[PDB]
Symmetry: C6
Subunit: 188 residues, 6 copies
């Protein structure tokens, strides 16, 4: 709808890599998250199965091993990497309404925050889920589960495929931002 | 759709902080509530589990500990902090149709109500839920539950993460409004 | 979408209170009904629990105590209070296509029907549900329930909060319409 | 969206009653069907309860007493009463593209089909469901149900309220069409 | 939305029957499929009931008697009868961009494919489902069902009503296309 | 909505086959995936039935035989075959903003990536699912299933019909791209 119209304006104001490659990969990630990945995680808790009769053990074991869902993490990441661009668009429009360094300092800082947000969320993915591969079986001993209980994840393989996809694209977006930084560094 | 078009008009009529930072944080909260948080709370009652055989104990215990859902509280808060801006937009448009102090008094009062509504809802969150952290286990003794019954919350950790997020952003919006008040106070 | 565009036209043709305050409160009620209240009532019958083994007792007890849902009553009320405005918009447009008293008599009658419809639905709410507070427990003795059966309502407290909200706003809309009537009465 | 834009064109081409009253009542019926009535019938078969252990008896008893749902009947009726208007709109547009009696004969026939379709569907409602009141209990003896089985309808009272509403409005639309016919009859 | 805008362009480029009657019946079928029929088939497998204890017998019996759902067959048919029109629209637009027989041969062939696709899908409906009437009871003896198992269809009568409706309209569309062929045949 | 407007621009910039046939088949695949196929796979795991009492055996057997769903594979394929066209559209627009071989090399490479992506996904379909026919019965011996367990697929025949459809259209799109390559090869 209006999203592509809005992205058209920010498309008209960027650099070689920024106009084309960064914008395409950003839309690439949104399409994957929306049309494909969001329904892989639909039954994440409904189809989580634990071999026990203890009431409440399923709730605490799912919450222990999935403190925040993968799709919610990716939704937050896309929002954080798109706000610096949104700020520049309004900042330029505000400057136009009133009417080198002013735009240069904002634009350079704008791509600096995207690298930080991109790397921070990638780091969170690794430490929180201990690698990018999801297991079929999780062993849970949190109260009130008696001793250790076996619980089984829903669609672990398909979730691994989409996890590798999102991580790979995010890593590419980091490299593109770094090269854009170098092109504005050699300019001096 | 038309929401960003409407927000464009109120964007053209504000001050330095108001045009950019307050508008972005407002859109920031809406995006989190809509695309991410609204489906964390989807199974709040369906996956609420109580260790009992008493019919009706689950209904009364959920109602006792969640008198109003977090997402409904945030939906009300966003509506209340956006109506003073909506009133100004129509008030100015009405003034334009007919055609310093008149706009100054409205604008100053407009940011005064936003601070009150923002703080009031933040206060309600603290007293009603006793802090911003959701527990795995709630103990319930309301009739008809016999003695005290253990009940287990769905996704307590993910709900805590989004609760901290919404509270933190709301606190920032309060500070931005206060600074805008100071800039219009030193003007005299 | 187009709803705000349509409301813009009727905004350009009204009086001081009518242009701003009545229009805002009308949009205020629609937002509450759509984005917040409509999913409080989602599981009204699914989570209605009765302490019995009699087949069909749940169906007849829910139907006895909720002959028409609150959200359906509010949906009907908003439609009825918006059609007199819709009639005027087409009546004026028809008059414009062909091309004081003619518009005055229609406009005065237009706000007269809104008061009647607003008060009629408020009266129905009171008599049908016996006050604006929803109870946790309902006692039901309709056939085929044996003797008297205890049944438990879903989310009674949250439904009470939204009921008080909609009633309070509707009462304010009545007062605004009455004042508009007085302003057109003192004119003579 | 575009529906009101399309209805605006046919609004500009009609008569006194046709431009305003018939168009409003048509939109009145669509709003009731869409925003309110369509979710009263959502659990029509899911909450249909029969007092039996015979497999398949629930399927045949629901199908016997509800050969076609009320909402599907109303959806068909609205489509049938809106196509004669749609034909005229394209027929006039086609005539405009190429460029008294020609339009008069089409317009007069156009309101003649609406009366027939309106009355035909109203007749079907009466004979198929034996009045406009829905009962709590239906007795079913179709195979494979043993002897006669008691089955219980979901939300019979709320469905009766909306049935009376749709029938009453349809009867009014018939009267408006007849008066329009008389105005074009006295013209001669 | 944009669908009626697109259909407006192809409306401006057709013949007497093609501009009006064929276009209306095509929209007539889409409306029935979308707003009414698509939710009759919603619980086709969920409410399919078999009188057995054999695991997997329900899956194989439903798959045996409904190799492809009616609504999916109609969705494919509408796509196939609308692509020849879509090809002509782009072919003409391409010809316009570059800038009797060329358009005549395409248009004549365009209505020739619609007749073939319309008749082919109607033939598939008859052979696959053995007439246009759906039965309440199906007897199934595919492995792993022991001996012959009784299974019961959901909403057989309502599905029969919509099946007769779609078949009747499709047969009318065939006759309209044939008459258009004759009008272009007598021209010579 | 805006998708057809965007496709209109890329329609105006292509060759004979590319403007018409490749664009139509691309829209042909999207329509099938969206309006028809996406709800065949809706209950892929909900209606997956295994003849066992072992907890967790259903989760591991479904994950073993469907590592990634067919609809998710097709969603990825459509995204990958549409990005080279999207890159060209922005690359040309960027060139227009600044202002033979430059466009020729991009366009020729653009159709070269589409052939590679089209063939790669078709190869994945064959090796992963061992042909294009889905079976009613799958035998599963992954841990924790004891010995070998019989499991039954939901709607195997309808999924086979749509699988053959998508594969056949993709093979045609490969042939069209190859012919376009030959036309640009004989040019030299």
């Amino acid at each position: 709808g209006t999203l592509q119209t809005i992205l058209g304006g920010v498309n008209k104001h960027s650099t070689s890599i920024g106009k084309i490659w960064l914008t395409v990969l950003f839309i690439f990630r949104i399409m994957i998250l929306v049309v494909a990945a969001k329904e892989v995680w639909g039954d994440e808790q409904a189809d989580f199965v634990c071999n026990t009769l203890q009431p409440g053990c399923k709730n605490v074991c799912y919450d222990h091993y999935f403190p925040i869902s993968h799709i919610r993490l990716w939704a937050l990441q896309l929002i954080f990497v798109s706000t610096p661009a949104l700020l520049v668009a309004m900042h330029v429009a505000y400057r136009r309404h009133e009417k080198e360094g002013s735009l240069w300092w904002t634009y350079t800082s704008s791509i600096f925050f995207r690298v930080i947000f991109e790397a921070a969320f990638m780091y969170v993915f690794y430490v929180m889920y201990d690698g990018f591969s999801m297991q079929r079986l999780v062993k849970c001993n949190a109260w009130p589960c008696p001793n250790t209980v076996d619980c089984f994840v829903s669609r672990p393989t398909e979730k691994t495929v989409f996890t590798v996809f999102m991580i790979a694209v995010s890593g590419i977006c980091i490299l593109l931002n770094v090269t854009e930084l170098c092109y504005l560094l050699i300019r001096y």
